[PDB]
Design an enzyme around this catalytic site. Structure first.
Site, PDB file in Angstrom:
ATOM      1  N   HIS A 261       0.809  -1.206   0.000  1.00  0.00           N
ATOM      2  CA  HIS A 261       0.000   0.000   0.000  1.00  0.00           C
ATOM      3  C   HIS A 261       0.849   1.265   0.000  1.00  0.00           C
ATOM      4  CE1 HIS A 261      -4.260  -1.438   1.121  1.00  0.00           C
ATOM      5  NE2 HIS A 261      -3.577  -2.492   0.712  1.00  0.00           N
TER       6      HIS A 261
ATOM      7  N   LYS B 269      -9.533 -13.382   9.342  1.00  0.00           N
ATOM      8  CA  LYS B 269      -9.032 -13.530   7.964  1.00  0.00           C
ATOM      9  C   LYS B 269      -7.644 -12.918   7.781  1.00  0.00           C
ATOM     10  CE  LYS B 269     -11.511 -13.959   4.309  1.00  0.00           C
ATOM     11  NZ  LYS B 269     -12.831 -13.507   3.774  1.00  0.00           N
TER      12      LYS B 269
ATOM     13  N   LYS C 201      -4.655 -11.753   5.228  1.00  0.00           N
ATOM     14  CA  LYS C 201      -4.233 -11.407   3.870  1.00  0.00           C
ATOM     15  C   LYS C 201      -2.921 -12.104   3.534  1.00  0.00           C
ATOM     16  CE  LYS C 201      -5.681 -10.146   1.002  1.00  0.00           C
ATOM     17  NZ  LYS C 201      -6.898  -9.637   0.310  1.00  0.00           N
TER      18      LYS C 201
ATOM     19  N   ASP D 126      -6.726 -15.211   2.356  1.00  0.00           N
ATOM     20  CA  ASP D 126      -6.874 -14.725   0.985  1.00  0.00           C
ATOM     21  C   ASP D 126      -5.499 -14.549   0.339  1.00  0.00           C
ATOM     22  OD1 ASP D 126      -7.550 -13.568  -1.422  1.00  0.00           O
ATOM     23  OD2 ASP D 126      -8.703 -11.904  -0.581  1.00  0.00           O
TER      24      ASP D 126
ATOM     25  N   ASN E  60      -4.958 -14.143  -2.683  1.00  0.00           N
ATOM     26  CA  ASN E  60      -5.161 -13.387  -3.930  1.00  0.00           C
ATOM     27  C   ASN E  60      -4.603 -14.085  -5.181  1.00  0.00           C
ATOM     28  OD1 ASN E  60      -5.160 -10.422  -2.099  1.00  0.00           O
ATOM     29  ND2 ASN E  60      -6.720 -10.835  -3.656  1.00  0.00           N
TER      30      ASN E  60
ATOM     31  N   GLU F 203      -9.956 -18.507   0.538  1.00  0.00           N
ATOM     32  CA  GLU F 203     -10.393 -17.536  -0.455  1.00  0.00           C
ATOM     33  C   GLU F 203      -9.362 -17.366  -1.565  1.00  0.00           C
ATOM     34  OE1 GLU F 203     -11.026 -13.455   0.934  1.00  0.00           O
ATOM     35  OE2 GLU F 203     -11.102 -12.804  -1.097  1.00  0.00           O
TER      36      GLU F 203
ATOM     37  N   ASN G 204     -13.402 -13.528  -4.366  1.00  0.00           N
ATOM     38  CA  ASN G 204     -13.872 -12.261  -4.910  1.00  0.00           C
ATOM     39  C   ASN G 204     -12.998 -11.811  -6.091  1.00  0.00           C
ATOM     40  OD1 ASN G 204     -11.747 -11.329  -3.285  1.00  0.00           O
ATOM     41  ND2 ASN G 204     -13.015  -9.901  -2.110  1.00  0.00           N
TER      42      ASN G 204
ATOM     43  N   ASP H 250     -19.849  -7.700  -2.734  1.00  0.00           N
ATOM     44  CA  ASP H 250     -19.299  -6.372  -2.453  1.00  0.00           C
ATOM     45  C   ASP H 250     -20.174  -5.427  -3.250  1.00  0.00           C
ATOM     46  OD1 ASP H 250     -17.816  -3.906  -2.575  1.00  0.00           O
ATOM     47  OD2 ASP H 250     -15.956  -5.020  -2.201  1.00  0.00           O
TER      48      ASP H 250
ATOM     49  N   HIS I 170     -18.341  -8.034   1.618  1.00  0.00           N
ATOM     50  CA  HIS I 170     -16.957  -7.562   1.680  1.00  0.00           C
ATOM     51  C   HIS I 170     -16.883  -6.086   1.305  1.00  0.00           C
ATOM     52  CE1 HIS I 170     -13.395  -6.316  -0.583  1.00  0.00           C
ATOM     53  NE2 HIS I 170     -12.666  -7.079   0.210  1.00  0.00           N
ATOM     54  N   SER I 171     -15.890  -5.396   1.863  1.00  0.00           N
ATOM     55  CA  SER I 171     -15.520  -4.033   1.448  1.00  0.00           C
ATOM     56  C   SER I 171     -14.106  -3.739   1.907  1.00  0.00           C
ATOM     57  CB  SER I 171     -16.485  -2.987   1.993  1.00  0.00           C
ATOM     58  OG  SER I 171     -17.779  -3.166   1.439  1.00  0.00           O
ATOM     59  N   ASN I 172     -13.340  -3.085   1.041  1.00  0.00           N
ATOM     60  CA  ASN I 172     -11.944  -2.779   1.329  1.00  0.00           C
ATOM     61  C   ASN I 172     -11.689  -1.275   1.266  1.00  0.00           C
ATOM     62  OD1 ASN I 172     -12.233  -3.069  -1.649  1.00  0.00           O
ATOM     63  ND2 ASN I 172     -10.025  -2.667  -1.650  1.00  0.00           N
TER      64      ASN I 172
HETATM   65 MG   LIG Z   1     -10.047 -11.188  -1.920  1.00  0.00          MG
END
Ligand SMILES: [Mg+2]
Ligand SMILES: [K+]
Lengths: 425, 426
Positions: free
Chosen positions: B27, B193, B195, B223, B225, B248, B271, B295, B322-324
């Site tokens: 990030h 969860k 990442k 997740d 990804n 995920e 997602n 989402d 979900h929301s990020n």
């Molecule tokens: Mg994801």
């Protein structure tokens, strides 16, 4: 907030022509139930649903549980309907095939939809908006409907009342005449022929004859699954490309899928796709290409929107199915169809066959101009319940001697040797 | 006499974002977002929150002007408008760089519709004096569960333009366990969860073990990804046994996810491979995923999310929300639709613990999360009001941060000059 204070489930009955179908023939009266809810601040939401004994029983058991409830909480309503039906078990597993109100599988859906349409009509009056605005707004301002043609006898056996204006229709001539009469008075741009009663070869001829008499008119045929696959194929070969769509010629998801694969014709159904699980199973087989919506048994207006969006996702057309109904159902059909972008096809309706004196709303029978129902700006369904008219049809319900529809039992009054067969031809 | 929209205000903002590590990279010290204000002729105000990258803004702005004087119940009109606008716009994005939730060019109509749809419904709800959930058929639950979303992170942003965050670094089991503890203590989350697909997969597995050891009876999820090959995903499954509630997107693509499931029988969530209705159809044909993380931001809003939930129910799939990188507005829109759906199968996903105490655009500051849940109340609409002072402030931080499109990949290149967007790296 807001709370419901009074729920009134009123069974009614009204006259019906001697209309032939796959099962046999219509009874002199068609059943129906009228729903009316009312809130602590004096607003009224109207509903219309099936009148058959099983459906009434559920409606009557639900109604008492609805007092003091928030009319926005449709989720709670569903939960309640599900409790009521679960407590009713066991229930009769075979009802009248063509009368969804008698279907055990639709116990919850039929009942939840009956009140859902009323709950939303209430919401819409309170908001002073037409019903369609709660659903997301009118995509169209006029909803096209189709000409619902039937083969019919001259009059009912044992003459329970005065014979109808239409007269008998058993040949291509009279079918044309019946259509000509319908289109003139109402303005329909699409034609549906109820089939599965007369010989298939003959029923095909009646469509050819409608081709000539009405060129450029979308044509639909519906044997209600009363033809074998072999017959459905042979008849498809005679029909060519004359039809807009080929509706439930043969029974079962597998038979439909085989028929489409072999003939290429776009098939429609209201019999093999009647709920969401059946939709899942159809999609896996590619059984049907158009699904007829019906808010009455699919679980309401919002559920109908969900179906339309799934149909879009899976590349299916969306049409609409009908059962004998009055004005409240008609406006409900129109309002949800007006709100879904991908309902191209003209909705089916029974309205032409219902009598002007026997309507339950103020203003008499609703107008169909240019084959379309107008969506005004009147709050809710834009309808007022004529109570004197209600009482009259309620009283006719008590005297008719009918508590659940049976087209098979009725045809046995004509041919004593008649037994239900499917597929007959 | 129909109620009508008089005012529309789209407002870009930026908020401090920790050095959070992910599959793509890391990030940036800031993250973007856009805030939508709607106003009606009778003084009612509907709110929205959406994506803050330059191309999204441009779309929101384009549509904004068309909205004045229209019936906020007529959402079908709003859809036709968003479609016409998008049709009159070139993609202006390379497909290889569409790596974040909602970034795909195909999502244009859906992201923009969802942005305003929420505000249109929040409007309706304020005018009706009812909570938003009531527009969506009523609340099935009054509390919506959420998990603790754990990240590996560096102690600080390289050449940071402000003081380092209070979290410290998180690159081993000890520091991650501690990071979860902090969140569980503060918010009472009942599930976790992580990442993943960021550190070596054996190392990340060990961090899950330590979390399971530290917290028993806590459902655990990851997740990665899509950053694990099929073979890696399989090797990790072996090492983890049944430590996990679900995986995920451990492996990329519909085909890989399907194959992984066949080979293991494991519950796979996504997602990434099911992010729209066409993808749903193709997934269902292959049986790629068993759980869809919805989402509302990119699926097309709240009503579309309900359609999705119903569709999952129909096809036997689990659903969760979900929301990020979001603020309180998003959190509530998400919570409300989450509250109207009968088939909510797992705790929802949120970034909210990461957002800094002082950086909200709502009165009261940061929304409460009690016992790992968000309360649905009787307050009209979302039950939220814009702090126009905090708004102006974070709009200024937008103007001065020098970020107009998120790029975790470029950002990672400042630490590791040879860094590329590899997937699957492991
Ligand atoms: Mg994801
Ligand atoms: K049919």
């Amino acid at each position: 907030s807001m709370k419901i204070t009074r729920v009134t489930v009123t069974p009614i009955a009204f006259r019906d022509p001697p209309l032939l179908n796959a099962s046999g023939i219509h009874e002199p009266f068609a059943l129906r139930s009228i729903i009316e809810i009312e809130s602590d601040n004096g607003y009224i939401g109207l509903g219309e649903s099936y009148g058959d004994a099983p459906a009434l029983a559920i409606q009557q058991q639900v109604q008492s549980q609805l007092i003091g409830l928030d009319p926005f909480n449709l989720n709670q309503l569903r939960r309640i309907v599900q409790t009521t039906v679960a407590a009713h078990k066991p229930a009769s597993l075979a009802g009248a095939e063509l009368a969804p109100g008698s279907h055990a599988s639709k116990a919850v859906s039929n009942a939840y939809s009956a009140f859902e349409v009323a709950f939303l009509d209430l919401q819409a009056r309170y908001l002073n908006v037409p019903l369609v605005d709660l659903l997301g707004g009118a995509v169209r301002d006029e909803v096209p409907f189709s000409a619902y043609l039937f083969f019919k006898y001259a009059q009912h056996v044992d003459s329970p009342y005065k014979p109808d204006n239409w007269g008998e229709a058993l040949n291509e001539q009279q079918i044309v005449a019946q259509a000509a009469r319908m289109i003139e008075a109402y303005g329909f741009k699409s034609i549906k022929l109820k089939a599965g009663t007369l010989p298939p070869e003959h029923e095909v001829a009646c469509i050819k004859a409608l081709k000539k008499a009405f060129p450029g008119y979308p044509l639909r045929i519906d044997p209600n699954g009363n033809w074998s696959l072999e017959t459905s194929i042979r008849m498809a070969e005679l029909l060519g490309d004359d039809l807009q769509y080929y509706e439930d010629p043969t029974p079962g998801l597998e038979g439909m899928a085989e028929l489409h694969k072999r003939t290429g014709l776009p098939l429609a159904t209201n019999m093999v796709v009647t709920d969401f699980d059946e939709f899942r199973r159809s999609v896996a087989q590619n059984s049907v290409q158009i699904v007829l919506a019906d808010h009455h048994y699919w679980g309401g207006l919002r559920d109908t929107q969900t179906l339309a969006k799934m149909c879009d996702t899976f590349g299916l057309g969306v049409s609409m199915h009908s059962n004998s109904h009055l004005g409240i159902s008609l406006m409900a059909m129109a309002h949800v169809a007006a709100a879904v972008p991908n309902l191209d096809y003209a909705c089916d309706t029974h309205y032409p066959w219902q009598e002007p004196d026997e309507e339950v709303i103020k203003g008499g029978k609703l107008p169909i101009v240019d084959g379309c129902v107008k969506i005004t700006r009147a709050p809710g369904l834009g309808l007022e319940l004529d109570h004197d008219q209600l009482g009259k049809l309620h009283d006719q319900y008590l005297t008719c001697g009918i508590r659940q529809r049976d087209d098979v039992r009725q045809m046995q009054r004509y041919k004593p040797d008649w037994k239900a067969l499917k597929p007959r031809f």
